[PDB]
Amino acid sequence: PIETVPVKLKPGMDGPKVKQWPLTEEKIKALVEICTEMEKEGKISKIGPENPYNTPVFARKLVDFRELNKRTQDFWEVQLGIPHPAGLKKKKSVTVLDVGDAYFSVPLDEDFRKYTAFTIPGIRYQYNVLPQGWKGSPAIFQSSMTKILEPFKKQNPDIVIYQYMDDLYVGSDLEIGQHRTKIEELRQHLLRWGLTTPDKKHQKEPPFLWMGYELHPDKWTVQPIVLPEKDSWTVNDIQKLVGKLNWASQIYPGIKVRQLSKLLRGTKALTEVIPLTEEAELELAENREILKEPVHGVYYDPSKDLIAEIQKQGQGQWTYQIYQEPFKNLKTGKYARMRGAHTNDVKQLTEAVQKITTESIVIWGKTPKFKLPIQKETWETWWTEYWQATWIPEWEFVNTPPLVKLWYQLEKEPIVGAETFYVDGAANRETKLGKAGYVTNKGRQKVVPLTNTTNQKTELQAIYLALQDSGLEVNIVTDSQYALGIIQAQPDKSESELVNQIIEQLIKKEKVYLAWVPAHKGIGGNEQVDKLVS
Amino acid sequence: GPISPIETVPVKLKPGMDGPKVKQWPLTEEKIKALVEICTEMEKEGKISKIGPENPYNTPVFAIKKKDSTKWRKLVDFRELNKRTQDFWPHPAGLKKKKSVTVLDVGDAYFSVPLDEDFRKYTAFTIPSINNETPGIRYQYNVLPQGWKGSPAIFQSSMTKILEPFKKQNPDIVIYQYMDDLYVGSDLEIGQHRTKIEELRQHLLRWGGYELHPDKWTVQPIVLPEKDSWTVNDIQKLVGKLNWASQIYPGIKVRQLSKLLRGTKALTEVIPLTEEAELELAENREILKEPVHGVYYDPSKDLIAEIQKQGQGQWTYQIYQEPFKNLKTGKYARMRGAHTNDVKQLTEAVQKITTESIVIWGKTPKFKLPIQKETWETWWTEYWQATWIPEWEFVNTPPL
Ligand SMILES: O=C1Cc2ccc(-c3ccco3)cc2C(=O)N1O
Ligand SMILES: [Mn+2]
Ligand SMILES: [Mn+2]
């Protein structure tokens, strides 16, 4: 009864014709029983050798639609992500329905049924429903499921129906008896469209399993994820492996899928043996201890505010909690990013505030109030002096050490009575020899030999020397904007050990004034140290 | 649902270009609710139609409120679709010269001319749900949409017939049209400008604001410091200042000033100006007022606007098509969010610079913004009050 979705192949491309693998009397009989069943249920139709196309079938039954998927058009996946149980509000009555044979109950475009052709190892088959494993079956089903559900939701405004794939979440603040009949209507409404809902895939009492979450009356806990410790993986339970683990990635961050997936750079048959490259053995194992950690949260109350508190941890890691009542957290997580060039803690905190803000808008459609381990004056000093535009939403200070600080601050005007160091660096040809030195208005000077360096590194080395051999107050003059701009970025950490100790000198200093002049002009301080590194 | 009674114009994309495929970003609850109430009424009025996942294209959508506006206006970020849409088929240089110019939102008039039935799939947009509770609601346009660069081009025929009864009873009213807006300027009294802009407004209603004053828009020129007691630091800051302007004006000379700093001197030491350097300074001060050589507007090239954060609530900007040959330079101050929000001031300045560029040249610039991508991409939609959207690059290298 459902209107079909028009499916076109990619332009200039024909259907798939991958030869069938011939196999044994053992499971070649099960297929035709399976298939007659499917033909007796209307899911597949018979045609002879008229259409050319072929899709391999292995052996419950399995179909390999990979070659067909590479030729099928792109479908806009409407979903911006999965739902989070913390996004749910508490409803007096909850129900989780699951549709029986979700895919095998939505008709396929009749013009597109020809390329679906396959042959039992003989009678040839072509699908008339959404096939499992095809590219478009998820998008077409959910679209079909939605507009099939819309007249029901409109005529039943007192209930809320959340739909994702097979599982239907049906919540309401109605009486259980009234909530009872409203469900049976939905099942009867679904049954009239050819979508049955079995009775023990029907979830009646609670802990209600919706998308791998146990929905207790006043809490939710993620379903313990357990996936196999077998010995000889094949690339189907390697593709079901990458599948049901990179949905776990949404609730469990840090679960990456690069290794496994890379194992299908080949024309492999879906049933043949697949060797684990030893790179892939730590992939699973790295987070098998992450997967075993529990997750639990509370439900959302829109009458109260959202509070987000962030804490500082080791090695550029940050923890955060999102709650409405104190310590009754809706969501918690970890964030870990140190920059590849130069980062400081205030930047990382600004990034953490922004990353939580976005996922808060994703889940609740609003920005939380933040409690951050930073002084108002520390922040005020940072953003007003930062060369770039920056800002954070409405927040308040929380005294949870280690607090975030500014570890140094360059001065804005040159310092009277402070030693003025002019620095420079240089390199020569293929010589693999560098010079970084300084000259001082008081006559002080120094030059050191360098081994394997860039040209920036010489300029950064020159600045570092002036910080070493100077008092608590110093004015430094460089011709290098690279060096001057790196300190202008105000980093407190670095992967460059030279930069790290320039920081360490900068922290120990009392007043530093960095100054820039164009090289190879008549400037008195620049040219003297420039000749010394000639 | 209902087809348009009047006839459709054929439109195509650029050669060899496909339609836009831009992911929808997360929306606040108030905007989704606003987009839901707006798109339902638009769908009932046959202006948009629900589509499935067979359409592989998508364009972002959100909603804004204009200055002092209390109602939500839908904004569709057509920046990608416009980039891939064909060019169609003059800019009134007198719009800049008028005393008062008002901007009117004529985007609703576009909802009466139908979109090419074969072009409609490229206007697909999806309204996301909170916490992805339900799949987003997909739509495409059946009529000329607001924010598409092809809508005012196709409507130019109809718009001309609506405005010429007004424009020859007022042959000195400059009327420029850019995207969903009409820019209308005059040299009239402020009292007599407002009711003549309201009569043109109600003449539009016969078929079926926000005010500017462009004759006092400033240009901030290059200004050298002129203190009286120059220190070493004050002079070597002017030397790199002048050595910088030598890229714009090749006639700058900095040597006799640099001669004053010869020898390793302390930055705070005051340096007397040997008078052959003040001649170099007075000449440099006056070789900064002439027009830059080779500066003109090429409407076949993109505009570029760079914005610098000066702090204390002031922001400098330069409009140019190729470096050092600036078409316009300026500075803003005391905008909304001053001394409290850098993003809100940058978002305002982007709106102000673009409004100027539309009035002057009839084109919006490509902005280089002094902000990380992630900070700007988190807040800019919260302060946007313009019916157009420009394109931007992010600047992470400190200037001067
Ligand atoms: O002696 C010299 C000559 C020089 C030329 C060009 C550049 C340069 C190009 C782009 C950025 O910087 C830098 C230097 C420099 O640092 N020293 O020291
Ligand atoms: Mn140098
Ligand atoms: Mn040098």
Curated annotation (Swiss-Prot), chain A:
Annotated effect of mutating residue 421 to I: Loss of cleavage between p51 RT and p15
Consequence of changing residue 168 to A: 76% loss of DNA-directed DNA polymerase activity. 60% loss of RNA-directed DNA polymerase activity
Domain called Reverse transcriptase: residue spans: 41-215
Effect in UniProt of substituting residue 148 to A: 71% loss of DNA-directed DNA polymerase activity. 61% loss of RNA-directed DNA polymerase activity
Outcome (variant: residue 209 to A): No effect on RNA-dependent DNA polymerase activity. No effect on RNA 5'-end and 3'-end cleavages
Outcome of swapping residue 148 to L: 80% loss of DNA-directed DNA polymerase activity. 23% loss of RNA-directed DNA polymerase activity
Effect of residue 421 to W: Slight delays in replication. Virions contain primarily p51 RT
Region (RT 'primer grip'): 208-216
Outcome of swapping residue 421 to V: Slight delays in replication. Virions contain primarily p51 RT
Phenotype for residue 207 to A: No effect on RNA-dependent DNA polymerase activity. Complete loss of RNA 5'-end cleavage. No effect on RNA 3'-end cleavage
Effect of residue 134 to Y: 58% loss of DNA-directed DNA polymerase activity. 42% loss of RNA-directed DNA polymerase activity
Listed transmembrane segments: none
Effect of residue 423 to G: Almost complete loss of virion production
Record comment regarding domains: RT is structured in five subdomains: finger, palm, thumb, connection and RNase H. Within the palm subdomain, the 'primer grip' region is thought to be involved in the positioning of the primer terminus for accommodating the incoming nucleotide. The RNase H domain stabilizes the association of RT with primer-template. The tryptophan repeat motif is involved in RT p66/p51 dimerization.
Subunit-structure text: Heterodimer of p66 RT and p51 RT (RT p66/p51). Heterodimerization of RT is essential for DNA polymerase activity. The overall folding of the subdomains is similar in p66 RT and p51 RT but the spatial arrangements of the subdomains are dramatically different.
Name of the protein in question: Reverse transcriptase/ribonuclease H
Gene name of this polypeptide: gag-pol
UniProtKB/Swiss-Prot annotation, chain B:
Effect of residue 162 to V: 70% loss of DNA-directed DNA polymerase activity. 64% loss of RNA-directed DNA polymerase activity
Outcome, altering residue 257 to S: 21% loss of polymerase activity. 16% loss of RNase H activity
Outcome (variant: residue 277 to L): 68% loss of polymerase activity. 10% loss of RNase H activity
Gene: gag-pol
Effect after changing residue 151 to T: Complete loss of polymerase activity. No loss of RNase H activity
Result of altering residue 181 to N: Loss of pyrophosphorolysis (reverse of the polymerase reaction). No effect on RNase H activity
Superkingdom, taxonomy of origin: Viruses
Consequence recorded when altering residue 151 to G: Complete loss of polymerase activity. No loss of RNase H activity
Positions of short motif Tryptophan repeat motif: 376-392
UniProt effect for mutating residue 242 to S: 17% loss of polymerase activity. 30% loss of RNase H activity
Domain Reverse transcriptase residue range list: 45-212
Outcome when changing residue 162 to D: 16% loss of DNA-directed DNA polymerase activity. 24% loss of RNA-directed DNA polymerase activity
Effect on the protein of changing residue 179 to L: 90% loss of polymerase activity. No loss of RNase H activity
Substitution effect: residue 53 to G: 74% loss of polymerase activity. 86% loss of RNase H activity
Reported effect, residue 182 to V: 22% loss of DNA-directed DNA polymerase activity. No loss of RNA-directed DNA polymerase activity
Substitution effect: residue 379 to F: No effect on RT p66/p51 heterodimerization
Effect of residue 162 to A: 71% loss of DNA-directed DNA polymerase activity. 61% loss of RNA-directed DNA polymerase activity
Effect caused by changing residue 288 to S: 31% loss of polymerase activity. No loss of RNase H activity
Site entry: Essential for RT p66/p51 heterodimerization: 379, 392
Protein name: p51 RT
